[PDB]
Design a protein around this nucleic acid. Structure first.
Ligand SMILES: Nc1nc2c([nH]c(=O)n2[C@H]2C[C@H](O)[C@@H](COP(=O)(O)OP(=O)(O)OP(=O)(O)O)O2)c(=O)[nH]1
Ligand SMILES: [Ca+2]
Ligand SMILES: [Ca+2]
Ligand SMILES: [Cl-]
Ligand code: NA
Length: 328
DNA sequence: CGGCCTACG
DNA sequence: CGTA
DNA sequence: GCCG
């Protein structure tokens, strides 16, 4: 009854198994810190199965038949149902390794590999990193300076005002260019850790060279606290107004030609697990290669022309899911 | 057992 | 290596 | 860790 791929079932933003999904996601995250991407995926997939269920899981027998629930994930759920707490999950939560890798990897510019190396060197706190700043990249220095603000959620209420300053710069850079809100906010989220915008122009080719022009105008307006600088993705830190002040916010800007816009919209709208599952489904079940630029048939060596996300789901033989049901 | 998404900066 |  |  429950299909094995998350892109085959609707997954709403809020659901009926929040506590169980959150515990499995802790185990997924810990697997990621240890470099076990397979274990990370299984725990994330099991969590997403629960998000897709129509009612709360009451008893272990309701997990029989569900995909991605074997010995380990089933024992986690069983302990939460019987005791309200999973010993394994709480042990991870209070471990020094978990807490430190979580704190380090949440820094912009620090990935699992860097956080792991710092952990092995004996570092444990942000103040530890600030005392040896010559070891840091410029990106990591910015992530560390702005860490407090960047750890505060961006509110959907902030986004409209930010979209209009981006739209102003985009319109000067290229009249007729459009800005589309993507990411979690497009899936209905009321907060997020960053804002994601997709930029295009209805005349194919006109978008070439656009993003540098946009970033030069935003920087001239004094709005850019950090950015990396030809390119098509920019990961920047923006000055967002607040009452009598301002706060730093992460903003991602992406440019796509209009021919690729449906693929880019699909990819940047997520969720991350949804898109990994969709790409896995495309390749393993349909023999087609999917990315944020297009959908390739490697037999005929042809790209599928899409005018909408609906087109892409149809070409993969999948029932259409609106963004709000892509919260795997 | 192999596989686990696929890009760009 | 980082980022999405 | 789980699926096929
Ligand atoms: N294919 C692919 N897409 C990814 C990856 N990471 C990642 O964030 N994306 C896509 C799907 C995400 O929904 C989208 C935006 O990323 P994000 O980290 O801002 O996620 P979000 O908006 O859903 O989350 P948030 O800001 O509310 O916390 O980018 C990845 O590793 N692979
Ligand atoms: Ca986001
Ligand atoms: Ca983002
Ligand atoms: Cl693994
Ligand atoms: Na990071």
């Amino acid at each position: 009854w429950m299909p094995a791929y998350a892109c085959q079932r609707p997954t709403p933003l809020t659901h009926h198994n929040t506590g169980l999904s959150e515990a499995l996601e802790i185990l997924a995250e810990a697997a990621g810190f240890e470099g076990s991407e397979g274990r990370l995926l299984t725990f994330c997939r099991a969590a997403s199965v629960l998000k897709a269920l129509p009612s709360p899981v009451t008893t272990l027998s309701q997990l029989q038949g569900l995909p991605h629930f074997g010995e380990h994930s089933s024992r986690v759920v069983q302990e939460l149902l019987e005791h309200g707490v999973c010993e394994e999950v709480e042990r991870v939560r209070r471990s020094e390794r978990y807490q430190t890798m979580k704190l380090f990897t949440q820094i912009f510019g620090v990935g699992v590999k860097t956080a792991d190396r710092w952990y092995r060197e004996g570092l444990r706190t942000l103040d530890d990193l600030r005392e040896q700043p010559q070891k840091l990249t410029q990106q990591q220095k910015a992530g560390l300076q702005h860490h407090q603000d960047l750890s505060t959620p961006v509110l959907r209420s902030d986004v409209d005002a930010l979209q209009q300053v981006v739209e102003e710069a985009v319109g000067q850079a290229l009249p007729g260019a459009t800005v589309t809100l993507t990411g979690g906010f497009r899936r209905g989220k009321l907060q997020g850790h960053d804002v994601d915008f997709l930029i295009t122009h209805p005349k194919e080719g006109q978008e070439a060279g656009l993003l540098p022009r946009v970033m030069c105008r935003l920087q001239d307006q004094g709005l850019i606290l950090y950015h990396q600088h030809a390119f098509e993705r920019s990961f920047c830190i923006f000055r967002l107004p607040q009452p009598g002040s301002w706060k730093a916010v992460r903003v991602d800007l992406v440019v796509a030609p209009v021919s690729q816009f449906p693929f880019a919209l699909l990819g940047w709208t997520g969720s991350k697990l949804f898109q990994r599952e969709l790409r896995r489904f495309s390749r393993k079940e349909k023999g087609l290669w999917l990315n944020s630029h297009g959908l390739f048939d490697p037999e005929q060596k042809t790209f599928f022309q899409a005018a909408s996300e609906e087109d892409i789901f149809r070409h993969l033989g999948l029932e259409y899911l609106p963004p709000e049901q892509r919260n795997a």
